[PDB]
């Protein structure tokens, strides 16, 4: 037997977040290496795992790792990064930084991946994951003409790569803010909860990339907030037994006469509903507040969206008989008595969500300088832009914010100059909405950090550094 061979293989097969870390520390032990020690650790790992079950992955990884851009991992060799949040994008950012050769510390306030909700995928993201060795880390990946990963399956897959490329990950730790460098001869340090491990508290860094999801407002940035008429969104996951007759029900994605025939037997009033068949029978529907008060899923009509959706106002029981009512008729009962999958809490996976307010940051980047040290702050993903989930551009643009944040760190580690690096980034960010698979570079395969492999007719000078004068924060 060969502990190293065995540990790598359960590590790859791992379906629990606490088991990715477990088997990995074991592989590190077996290969006489450490985790969170960068590419020198990655290089020591791969060389000693020169065997059938691993070699195709190193080719894939190194092929990317040696794309013209990363300078064979020498570009950001003098850059210390802090990445906040281990959602899909944050991890993608870490991967990108790891490859650029930056020191990568990722902090994350949870301790597991418990979200089942299925995410639609763009042709280009599908391929990106494939090139990162998704097919080894995940069996049922974009399986068939299917183009959807589940949140946790994505996170697991990405985490395994983050670890391989030597990202230092700390769990159960909350980013709160920043410690200003107290003197002429210090650097920027984070502010973490609950009390972080010795080194992490003293870990200094010039690049902070926060991918801490929609709800986190990072100090200094201005968030624009558009509100329209209310849209309540229900999501539901039912267990996929994958029985022959259970896997013979087509996927779905008020206009058609179906949304009309839904009111007949069930009396459920929905404008649109979506079905995905993944690890779970995924359903997402947009409900009318008019009928949610009627069939008593919401207890009482509160005029302010936020309050109308609290744990108190939402009846959990009726939400299940509402969700299964829509799900049962939607498949014409071809899936039988559907049982919910659980959280997170043993609670059944069903949630009433908000679709009313779309948060967008005014700038995607900000630089802070105090007593000599420069700090580059970048947003990536949901905290940069809040996506209309029915359209499904979240993973697409998060991954884009990630690529365009890594390009920023590249120019940064060339000393390009605060006002400039921002102007490049902000010229690219001005595109982040327009972006569709329709208006972007056709050769998906050729996609890389160089933003012009992605954006046709790109203008790096759409914003002059004189238009961003106050995104640079000279505190003295
Ligand atoms: C039900 C649902 C359906 C969706 N539909 C689609 C779809 O069909 N297609 C599509 O492409 N996208 C879809 N979206 C959007 C997509 O899920 C998100 O945009 C995506 O998760 C973005 O990843 P993220 O890392 O930016 O955000 P998140 O996944 O929310 O990552 C944030 C993470 O950072 C952590 N965090 C927050 N604050 C701190 C802190 N202070 N310190 C440390 N960690 C912190 C949290 O633990 C969290 O894990 C959907 C989303 C949901 C929820
Ligand atoms: Cl987990």
Torsion sign, CA atoms 380, 385, 388, 392 = negative
How far is residue 95 from each of residues 27, 92, 138, measured CA to CA in Å? 20, 5, 17
Token code pair at residue 441: 């570079």
Query: Taking a C-beta distance cutoff of 8 angstroms, is the pair 12, 160 a contact?
Result: yes
| Buried b or exposed e, range 120-140, using 16+ CB within 10 angstroms | bbbebbbbbbeebbbbbbbee
350-354/232-239 β-pairing:
antiparallel
* DSSP symbol at 29: H
Q: Is 40 left (phi over 0), alpha (psi -120 to 50) or beta?
A: alpha
Is residue 272 annotated as involved in ligand binding? no
Architecture of domain 1-476: 3-Layer(bba) Sandwich (3.50)
* DSSP symbol at 377: E
Q: How far apart are CA 227 and CA 18, in angstroms?
A: 39
**For residue 92, which of 78, 104, 80 has the smallest C-alpha distance?**
104
- The pocket around ligand 1, CB under 6 angstroms, is made up of 84-90, 107-110, 117, 119-120, 151, 174-175, 211-213, 216, 235, 381-382, 387, 389, 392-396, 398
Q: How far apart are CA 430 and CA 53, in angstroms?
A: 43
The contacts of residue 91 (CB under 8 Å, 6+ apart) are 106, 155, 158, 159, 161, 162
Token code pair at residue 313: 């106002």
Nearest CA to ligand 1 atom 49: 87
130-138 long-range contacts, CB within 8 A, separation 24+: 131/60, 131/63, 131/64, 132/60, 132/61, 132/64, 132/95, 132/157, 132/158, 132/161, 133/56, 133/57, 133/60, 133/61, 133/161, 136/12, 136/56, 136/57, 137/12, 137/161
| Ligand 2 centroid to residue 156 C-alpha, Å | 8
Token code pair at residue 61: 């990884």
Distance of CA 337 to the CA centre of its chain: 33
How far is residue 240 from each of residues 115, 201, 285, measured CA to CA in Å? 15, 43, 19
| Ligand 2 centroid to residue 91 C-alpha, Å | 15
| Ligand 2 centroid to residue 98 C-alpha, Å | 23
Resolution at which this structure was determined, Å: 2.9
Q: What are phi and psi of 11, to 5 degrees?
A: -60, -45
- H or E stretch including 312? none
How many other C-beta atoms are found inside a 10 Å radius of the C-beta of residue 191? Answer: 12
Peptide bond into 194 cis (omega under 30): yes
| Ligand 1 centroid to residue 215 C-alpha, Å | 9
Q: How far apart are CA 342 and CA 239, in angstroms?
A: 9
Ligand closest to 354 (CA) is: 1
Ligand closest to 159 (CA) is: 2
Q: How far apart are CA 140 and CA 129, in angstroms?
A: 13
**For residue 283, which of 348, 367, 218 has the smallest C-alpha distance?**
348
Is residue 282 annotated as involved in ligand binding? yes
168-170/148-150 β-pairing:
unpaired
Is residue 313 annotated as involved in ligand binding? no
Residue owning tokens 């306030």 = 109
């Amino acid at each position: 037997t060969n502990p190293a061979h065995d540990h790598f293989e359960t590590f790859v097969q791992a379906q629990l977040c606490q088991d990715v870390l477990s088997s990995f520390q074991g592989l590190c032990r077996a290969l006489g290496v450490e985790s969170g020690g960068g590419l020198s650790q990655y290089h020591k790992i791969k060389a000693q795992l020169n065997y059938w079950s691993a070699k195709s992955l190193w080719a894939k990884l190194d092929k990317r790792a040696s794309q013209p851009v990363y300078q064979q991992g020498q570009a950001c060799t003098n850059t210390k990064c802090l990445v906040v949040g281990a959602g899909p994008c944050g991890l993608r950012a870490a991967v990108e930084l790891a490859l650029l050769g930056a020191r990568v510390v990722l902090v994350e306030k949870r301790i597991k991946f418990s979200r089942h909700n299925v995410l639609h995928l763009w042709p280009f993201t599908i391929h990106d994951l494939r090139a990162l060795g998704a097919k080894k880390f995940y069996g049922r990946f974009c399986t068939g003409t299917l183009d959807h990963i589940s949140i946790r399956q994505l996170q697991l897959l990405l985490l395994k790569v983050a670890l391989l490329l030597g990202v230092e990950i700390h769990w159960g730790v909350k980013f709160t803010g920043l410690q200003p460098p107290p003197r002429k001869g210090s650097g920027w340090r984070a502010q973490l909860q609950p009390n972080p491990p010795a080194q992490l508290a003293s870990y200094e860094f010039d690049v902070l990339i926060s991918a801490a999801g929609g709800k986190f407002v990072p100090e200094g940035f201005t968030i624009r907030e558009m509100r329209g008429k209310l849209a309540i969104g229900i999501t539901a996951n039912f267990v996929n037994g994958r029985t022959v007759e259970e896997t013979q029900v087509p996927e779905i994605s008020y206009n058609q006469k179906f949304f009309q025939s839904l009111l007949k037997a069930t009396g459920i009033d929905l404008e649109n509903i979506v079905y995905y068949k993944d690890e779970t029978h995924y359903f997402v529907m947009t409900a009318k507040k008019q009928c949610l008060l009627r069939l008593g899923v919401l207890r009482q009509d509160l005029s302010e969206t936020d309050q109308l959706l609290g744990k108190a106002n939402v009846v959990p029981e009726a939400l299940q008989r509402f969700a299964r009512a829509a799900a049962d008729f939607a498949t014409h009962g071809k899936l039988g008595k559907l049982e919910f999958a659980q959280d997170a809490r043993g609670r059944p996976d069903v949630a009433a969500f908000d679709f009313t307010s779309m948060m967008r940051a005014e700038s995607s980047a900000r630089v802070q300088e105090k007593h000599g040290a420069r700090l580059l702050l970048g947003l990536v993903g949901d905290c940069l832009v809040e996506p209309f989930w029915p359209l499904g551009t979240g993973v697409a643009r998060g991954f884009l914010a990630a690529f365009d944040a890594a390009w920023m760190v590249k120019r940064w580690a060339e000393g390009a100059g605060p006002l400039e690096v921002l102007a490049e980034r902000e010229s690219l960010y001005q595109l982040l909405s327009q972006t569709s698979p329709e208006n972007m570079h056709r050769n998906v395969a050729q996609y890389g950090l160089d933003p012009a492999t992605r954006y046709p007719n790109l203008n790096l000078r759409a914003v002059t550094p004189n238009q961003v004068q106050d995104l640079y924060d000279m505190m003295d």
